[PDB]
């Protein structure tokens, strides 16, 4: 099962529920589809890549890579990550 996280500019992101429910904020907003009035698509796409990175490398001695953040999206990703705790 998948959920839909819609960014502030209309892009729809379809991620698995397990991935989205790792966020306490999104679990609350689901309890389906979730609109983020404040997160543009260049930030929500990074958020979703983080869900993938988290689920893949959580509890792994297979050396984990760095999660890359472009300097131009860092301040917005920070605000979104701060608002979602994830």
């Amino acid at each position: 099962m998948y959920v839909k996280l819609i960014s502030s500019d209309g892009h729809e992101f379809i991620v698995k529920r397990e991935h989205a429910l790792t966020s306490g904020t999104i679990k609350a907003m689901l309890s389906n589809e979730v609109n983020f009035r404040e997160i543009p698509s260049h930030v929500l796409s990074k958020v979703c890549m983080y869900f993938t990175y988290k689920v893949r490398y959580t509890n792994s001695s297979t050396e984990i890579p760095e999660f890359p953040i472009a300097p131009e999206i860092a301040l917005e990703l920070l605000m979104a990550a701060n608002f979602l705790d994830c």
Partner: protein, 103 residues
């Protein structure tokens, strides 16, 4: 191996994974389960290259090196309206602001 993909059409992006040995058609099945449209009504593309149903995602260039979790590879998606396919259209994401002087 798992390959990590963003299936993109218009303003839709599916984040999912698949095996390198999984086939293009099986990915069309995965899209079908999500977007509720049959494999025959879809075309998958690598960049601009239309992909063949019988080929594995590895043969189509999706590998653990290029379809990574924190940097997934994009698969273009096109739908057939009625007897005829739309052209591959992937709307770009929004543009970040100029880097502040502070950075």
């Amino acid at each position: 191996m798992d390959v990590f993909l963003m299936i993109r059409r218009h303003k839709t992006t599916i984040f999912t994974d698949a095996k390198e040995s999984s086939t293009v058609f099986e990915l069309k099945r995965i899209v079908e389960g999500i977007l509720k449209r049959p494999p025959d009504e879809q075309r998958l593309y690598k960049d601009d290259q239309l992909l063949d149903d019988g080929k594995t995602l590895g043969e189509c260039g999706f590998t653990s090196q290029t379809a990574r979790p924190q940097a997934p590879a994009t698969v273009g998606l096109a739908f057939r309206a009625d007897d005829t396919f739309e052209a591959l259209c992937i709307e770009p994401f929004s543009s970040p602001p100029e880097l502040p002087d502070v950075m």
